[PDB]
Amino acid sequence: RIIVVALYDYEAIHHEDLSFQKGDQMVVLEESGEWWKARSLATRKEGYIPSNYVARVDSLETEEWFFKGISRKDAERQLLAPGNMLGSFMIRDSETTKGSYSLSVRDYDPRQGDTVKHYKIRTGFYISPRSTFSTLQELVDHYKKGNDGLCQKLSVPCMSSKPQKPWEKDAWEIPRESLKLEKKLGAGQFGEVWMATYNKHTKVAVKTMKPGSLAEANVMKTLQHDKLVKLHAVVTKEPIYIITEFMAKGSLLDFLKSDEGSKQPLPKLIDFSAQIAEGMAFIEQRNYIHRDLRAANILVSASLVCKIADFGLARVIPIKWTAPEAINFGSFTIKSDVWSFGILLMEIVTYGRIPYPGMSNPEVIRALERGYRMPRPENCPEELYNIMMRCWKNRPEERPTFEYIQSVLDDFYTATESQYEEI
Numbered sequence: 001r002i003i004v005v006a007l008y009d010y011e012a013i014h015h016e017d018l019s020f021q022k023g024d025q026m027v028v029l030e031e032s033g034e035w036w037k038a039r040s041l042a043t044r045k046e047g048y049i050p051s052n053y054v055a056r057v058d059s060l061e062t063e064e065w066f067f068k069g070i071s072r073k074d075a076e077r078q079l080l081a082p083g084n085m086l087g088s089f090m091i092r093d094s095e096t097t098k099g100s101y102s103l104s105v106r107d108y109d110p111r112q113g114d115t116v117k118h119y120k121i122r123t124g125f126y127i128s129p130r131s132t133f134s135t136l137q138e139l140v141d142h143y144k145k146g147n148d149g150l151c152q153k154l155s156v157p158c159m160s161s162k163p164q165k166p167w168e169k170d171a172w173e174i175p176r177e178s179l180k181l182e183k184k185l186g187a188g189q190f191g192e193v194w195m196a197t198y199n200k201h202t203k204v205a206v207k208t209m210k211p212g213s214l215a216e217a218n219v220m221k222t223l224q225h226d227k228l229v230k231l232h233a234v235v236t237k238e239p240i241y242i243i244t245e246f247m248a249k250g251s252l253l254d255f256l257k258s259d260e261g262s263k264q265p266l267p268k269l270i271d272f273s274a275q276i277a278e279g280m281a282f283i284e285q286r287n288y289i290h291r292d293l294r295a296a297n298i299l300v301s302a303s304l305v306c307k308i309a310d311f312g313l314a315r316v317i318p319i320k321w322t323a324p325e326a327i328n329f330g331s332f333t334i335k336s337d338v339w340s341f342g343i344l345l346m347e348i349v350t351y352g353r354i355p356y357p358g359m360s361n362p363e364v365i366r367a368l369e370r371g372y373r374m375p376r377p378e379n380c381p382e383e384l385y386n387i388m389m390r391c392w393k394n395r396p397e398e399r400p401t402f403e404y405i406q407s408v409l410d411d412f413y414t415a416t417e418s419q420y421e422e423i
């Protein structure tokens with residue numbers, strides 16, 4: 001007999017799914033993945049629920065200060081998000097010490113400004129050997145009344161964010177009749193992009209493909225990562241419709257040329273690059289290939305999260321983003337994507353400017369033949385430019401991995417020794 005509790009509110013929009021509010025308890029009857037079958041103790045109704053909206057009772061996820069399955073960088077991004085103040089904290093799974101936990105706290109220092117520092121939690125639990133607590137709760141309560149060795153006294157927990165609702169069960173292939181393409185967002189050579197609605201209940205974005213231009217997509221849907229755009233469903237009858245999640249802030253390029261994007265400081269740009277590098281690192285680990293990396297194929301969520309789009313799509317069917325071995329001999333690999341990432345990095349740091357300004361494609365290729373590379377912008381840090389340069393090496397094998405680039409960009413302003421604070 002398994003009993004869960006609802007972490008968030010939820011309004012049912014399907015046939016047999018269940019409505020519930022936070023605090024409500026339910027009885028688990030079946031575990032089929034994203035969708036679980038349960039019975040509400042409040043309404044006595046039996047129906048499907050999003051598994052990621054509930055958790056076992058009196059478990060750790062049920063705590064307002066515990067965030068499961070979150071990395072250090074993600075913790076820092078969430079803590080520095082709007083609606084948080086000094087002392088804002090969270091406890092999470094250590095991503096480098098499996099089985100143990102870590103505490104992330106929001107601090108401030110006049111040199112850097114608002115920061116986020118992380119302490120290791122050793123197992124009873126303790127951060128400092130002088131103070132030992134029976135439970136994690138005792139630890140937080142302790143560090144709420146004084147910092148006793150910490151850089152900041154604990155205040156309120158980090159602002160939680162309601163997760164994305166799971167797509168309809170077994171609804172990968174859908175009939176076109178279920179869609180209402182409401183607004184054309186953009187038009188291109190190979191198709192269009194619309195702001196649609198699925199079954200009158202879910203807002204989505206659909207990429208319509210011209211008939212001239214399924215297996216590859218069946219591969220794509222397995223590439224599920226926070227920094228890739230989620231791929232929900234597809235229409236299998238020409239013209240093919242690709243139904244994905246709707247990114248409110250549009251493409252990265254247009255955002256960088258927007259005014260709000262023009263207000264974005266340098267560390268924010270670097271952060272964007274870190275997210276993109278993270279996603280590309282995921283694709284790298286999965287041994288996949290993007291084949292068309294650029295700010296135009298990067299989308300931005302309303303919360304300023306960057307997600308890689310159109311990955312792998314170029315295969316099924318921009319010399320300035322293309323590596324020379326890819327232009328000359330058509331050799332497309334992950335390293336050419338590293339080159340493209342260099343160019344993208346230049347796009348981001350120059351707020352959407354077009355690469356090689358005042359240069360045509362063949363002119364650019366001939367420049368590359370001479371060993372020419374783009375100069376460093378005024379507002380671009382030397383080290384970041386070095387990263388770009390390492391991305392722009394003639395031999396692809398000598399180009400860095402997305403794992404390394406991600407590691408560097410994540411801790412760009414943090415010394416390796418200063419990742420975790422010791423007490």
Ligand SMILES: CN1CCN([C@H]2CC[C@H](n3cc(-c4ccc(Oc5ccccc5)cc4)c4c(N)ncnc43)CC2)CC1
Nearest residue numbers: 185186193205207242244245246247250251309310311313
């Ligand atoms: C002048 N600009 C105006 C803005 N136009 C851009 C193009 C349309 C927008 N656009 C495009 C997309 C979009 C949709 C589906 C898609 O399919 C795949 C996803 C992963 C892997 C393979 C395929 C890829 C991308 C998009 C979106 N989802 N949610 C929100 N906006 C979206 C973003 C703006 C480009 C021209």
Ligand SMILES: [Ca+2]
Nearest residue numbers: 381382383384
């Ligand atoms: Ca420097």
Ligand SMILES: [Cl-]
Nearest residue numbers: 027039040041
């Ligand atoms: Cl019962």
